[PDB]
């Protein structure tokens, strides 16, 4: 009858100062074409703080719901939705407002899943971003050199593995030796701990002809190193720039004043990617990722905070700590929060 959810009550990139936990919210009811899903796991995404800052659509004022992805059980549904779905069914979804005990989701956008496991949730946003961007914009083929930044993170783990499956030589940046050991276990050809080894020098010395593709999630100084490291006809994919999101504008400073000259001289490109412009590819990407995940052909690493200071991310209240965990760069794999029941 009543539930908890997170609500953006003031616009800010500081998630804690933007987002309030409301305790006595009515449970929303599904319409004819809708599922009501009881969330068991929810995904934490770097851009949750871009969302809370109001950067997705600056015309929209608080209050609004938050959280982009969920997995759980159908506990109620509209009559039309009941032709494809049934009460008790395990479903996952990408839609705003997953940070709630219950979320209304139109049946048309639900993804049926084998059971309610956090591994499947890693595929929804993190997996599909890596898959679709690389398939559509990567031009991957055997022997290409691929550099992945935030490689041990939520989407990075997939960009790594998909590039390896495309028979590419893959370099991955991360911030610790434990993350480097994880990258290695995924088949990474050259893991780099950027805190202990200078990435620019590694690339100049070991990849003098440059890299063919960059999956670039970090921005700032890493973006700059990436541009310099591009091969002739190289492609830098701008997936994100997380080093900037906490700032007031959300941007990360770059020394890009000579970027056009660099790109002309190399016949190289900088290509942006936004998931929501490629939704026509989503179902097929999800289907392929799910098959690999269920068959054990894809590592879907989940970080539920079990080794964080206050331990497992349980409950909506832990989302605040989970966002901090990401922004301290502590996670290995996809950060997920559990709503126990
Ligand atoms: N374009 C799209 O449609 C789309 C969709 C989804 C996600 N993305 C992008 O994918 C990237 C990763 O998102 P995610 O949600 O999967 O997170 P994640 O990679 O699981 O976590 C972020 C990681 O980035 C590094 N990092 C954290 N804060 C940093 C900082 N202030 N400066 C530099 N590096 C920092 C850390 O790894 P290290 O150990 O490597 O430092 C941290 O583990 C983001 O840029 C996100 O916006 C884009
Ligand atoms: O907006 C909707 O109706 C749900 C929906 C469906 C498919 C893809 C994206 C979205 N929503 C959405 C939006 Cl509008 C912004 C940021 C993140 C997400 Cl998941
Ligand atoms: O199917 C399409 O035409 C693209 C599209 C546009 C808006 C919202 C969703 C979708 N596709 C879609 C579907 Cl059909 C199921 C699950 C997830 C997504 Cl993103
Ligand atoms: O470019 C290609 O065709 C290879 C390619 C690139 C990016 C993403 C996926 C794929 N292929 C691919 C496919 Cl189609 C399914 C499962 C795993 C992989 Cl690596
Ligand atoms: O994630 C990013 O870096 C880009 C971005 C910016 C603002 C709002 C959403 C998104 N990405 C995004 C989208 Cl477009 C759909 C579902 C889930 C996510 Cl995390
Ligand atoms: Cl649709
Ligand atoms: Cl760096």
Curated annotation (Swiss-Prot):
It is an enzyme of class 1 (oxidoreductase). Its EC number is 1.3.1.48. The modification Phosphoserine is found at residue 269. GO terms for biological process: lipid metabolic process; negative regulation of fat cell differentiation. It is found in: Peroxisome. Coiled coil: none annotated. SMART domains: PKS_ER. It catalyses: 13,14-dihydro-15-oxo-prostaglandin E2 + NADP(+) = 15-oxoprostaglandin E2 + NADPH + H(+); 13,14-dihydro-15-oxo-prostaglandin E1 + NADP(+) = 15-oxoprostaglandin E1 + NADPH + H(+); 13,14-dihydro-15-oxo-PGF2alpha + NADP(+) = 15-oxoprostaglandin F2alpha + NADPH + H(+); 13,14-dihydro-15-oxo-prostaglandin F1alpha + NADP(+) = 15-oxoprostaglandin F1alpha + NADPH + H(+). The keyword Ion transport does not apply. Its main location: other. It holds the Pfam family ADH_zinc_N. The modification N6-acetyllysine is found at residue 5. NADP(+) binds at residues 155, 175, 179, 194, 217, 239, 245, 273-275, 331. One of its GO terms (cellular component) is peroxisome. Keywords: Acetylation, Lipid metabolism, NADP, Oxidoreductase, Peroxisome, Phosphoprotein. The keyword NADP applies. GO terms for molecular function: 15-oxoprostaglandin 13-oxidase [NAD(P)+] activity; zinc ion binding. Belongs to the zinc-containing alcohol dehydrogenase family. Quinone oxidoreductase subfamily. Functions as 15-oxo-prostaglandin 13-reductase and acts on 15-keto-PGE1, 15-keto-PGE2, 15-keto-PGE1-alpha and 15-keto-PGE2-alpha with highest efficiency towards 15-keto-PGE2-alpha. Overexpression represses transcriptional activity of PPARG and inhibits adipocyte differentiation. This is Prostaglandin reductase 3.
């Amino acid at each position: 009858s009543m539930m908890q959810k997170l609500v953006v009550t003031r616009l800010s990139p500081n998630f804690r100062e933007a987002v309030t936990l409301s305790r006595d919210c009515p449970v929303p009811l599904p319409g004819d074409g809708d599922l009501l899903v009881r969330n068991r796991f929810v995904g934490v995404n770097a851009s949750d703080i871009n969302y809370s800052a109001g950067r997705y659509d600056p015309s929209v004022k608080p209050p609004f719901d938050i959280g982009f992805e969920g997995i759980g059980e159908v506990v109620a549904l509209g009559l039309s939705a009941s032709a494809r779905y049934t009460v008790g069914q395990a479903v996952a979804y990408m839609a705003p407002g997953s940070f709630a005990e219950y979320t209304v989701v139109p049946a048309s956008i639900a993804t049926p899943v084998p059971s309610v496991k956090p591994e499947y949730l890693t595929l929804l946003v993190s997996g599909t971003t890596a898959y679709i961007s690389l398939k559509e914009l990567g031009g991957l083929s055997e022997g290409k050199k691929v550099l992945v930044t935030a490689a041990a993170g939520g989407t990075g783990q997939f960009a790594m593995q998909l590039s390896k499956k495309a028979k590419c030589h893959v370099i991955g940046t991360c911030s610790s030796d434990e993350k480097s050991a994880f990258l290695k276990s995924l088949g990474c050809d050259r893991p780099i701990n950027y805190k202990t080894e200078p990435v620019g020098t590694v690339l100049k010395q070991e990849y003098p002809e440059g890299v063919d593709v960059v999956y670039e999630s970090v921005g700032g100084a890493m973006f700059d190193l990436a541009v310099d490291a591009l091969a002739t006809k190289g492609r830098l994919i701008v997936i994100g720039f997380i080093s900037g999101y906490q700032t007031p504008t959300g941007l990360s400073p770059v020394k890009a004043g000579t970027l056009p000259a660099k790109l002309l001289k190399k016949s190289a490109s900088v290509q942006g990617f936004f998931l929501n412009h490629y939704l026509s590819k989503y179902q097929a990407a999800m289907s392929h990722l799910l098959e690999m995940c269920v068959s054990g052909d894809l590592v879907c690493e989940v970080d539920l905070g079990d080794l964080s200071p206050e331990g497992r991310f349980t409950g909506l209240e832990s989302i605040f700590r989970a966002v901090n965990y990401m922004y301290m760069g502590k996670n290995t794999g996809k950060i997920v929060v559990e709503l126990p029941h």
